[PDB]
């Protein structure tokens, strides 16, 4: 079969997405690096919460380092890097693995931070003891190791694929399957990447945060304002996260479900399924800039640290 009109990406969209990514890259770099510097530079600053903040920061930093450059290259050009050399094989074997590892790290760290804040607010104790407790370090190392182990299926999945289109021949790299386990991975991927990275984090960070707000929000007059402020700030993050991460999963599920092979006008649909995808990735980096931004408008003690 063949399509009467063959799909494309417009130049204006390429320029708009490129300029948006260029604007967002430097902020993602700078905010996270600045946050990371203070935690390890200052001797008196280190305790429990800083460990979780630093782990989340490092995961976000790895994500911003990986995702933007190769995607912008594939938007501008159309050739996978080092396609004719073995270095391109190594790149298409390694990059998705590291990207999925970073995403797992950031999501799991968000869940852990939400879990710990509730124990902070509603326990008869004075959390103290500058340093690092055993439980916190165990949690951090387990988070990192599990995140790295949860990406090998993406690691050994991508190969160069021969094909001829319109007469010409090119070199694409994709998740071609050769084993039953990888066949099952291909069969159920979009639902898994949707569920485990959208549903569970929202449930955890909503249940634990409403449980915290019940005790926190419900002498008294001078503190009710502070309790309201913190409640609103913590509930803004969940909405921001959901609205910024939804479109990519929406595009993937639409492509996996609605698209039909026998259709003739499907090319047009494919067009509509391309641009949105890119937008999602842009919005993804929105979660690698907002968490550091919140602390400058929240603590008023990190304000002086940021200024210095």
């Amino acid at each position: 079969n063949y399509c009467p009109q063959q799909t494309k990406i417009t130049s204006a969209f390429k320029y708009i997405n490129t300029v948006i990514s260029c604007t967002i890259f430097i902020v993602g770099m700078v905010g996270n690096a600045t946050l990371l510097r203070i935690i390890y530079q200052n001797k008196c600053m280190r305790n429990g919460p800083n460990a979780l903040i630093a782990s989340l920061a490092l995961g976000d930093l790895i994500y911003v380092v990986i995702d933007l450059p190769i995607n912008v290259f594939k938007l501008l050009a159309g050739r996978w890097p080092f396609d004719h050399n073995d270095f391109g094989v190594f790149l298409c074997k390694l990059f998705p693995f590291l990207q999925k590892s970073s995403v797992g790290i950031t999501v799991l760290n968000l869940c852990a931070l939400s879990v710990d804040r509730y124990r902070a607010v509603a326990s008869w104790s004075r959390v103290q003891g500058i340093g690092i407790p055993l439980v916190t370090a165990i949690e951090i190392v387990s988070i990192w190791i599990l995140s790295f182990i949860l990406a090998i299926p993406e690691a050994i999945g991508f190969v160069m694929v021969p094909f001829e289109y319109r007469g010409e021949q090119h070199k694409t790299c994709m998740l071609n399957a050769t084993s039953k386990f990888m066949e099952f991975y291909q069969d159920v991927k979009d639902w898994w990447l949707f569920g485990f990275y959208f549903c569970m984090p929202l449930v955890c960070t909503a249940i634990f945060y409403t449980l915290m707000t019940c005790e926190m929000l419900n002498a008294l007059s001078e503190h009710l304002k502070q309790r309201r402020e913190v409640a609103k700030t913590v509930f803004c993050l969940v909405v921001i996260f959901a609205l910024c991460w939804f479109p990519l999963h929406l595009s993937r599920i639409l492509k996996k479900t609605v698209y039909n092979e026998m259709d003739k006008n499907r090319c047009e649909l494919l067009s509509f399924l391309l641009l949105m995808d890119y937008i999602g990735i842009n919005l993804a980096t929105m979660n690698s800039c907002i968490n550091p931004i919140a602390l400058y408008f929240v603590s008023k003690k990190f304000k002086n640290c940021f200024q210095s």
Binding site: N1, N71, V161, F163, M174, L175, A177, L273, I281
Partner: peptide, 21 residues
Amino acid sequence: CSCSSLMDKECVYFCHLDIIW
């Protein structure tokens, strides 16, 4: 990008200039 058909060259082409995910 991955569709289990290699004869459906339209899907392959879509896979060619789509982001890595």
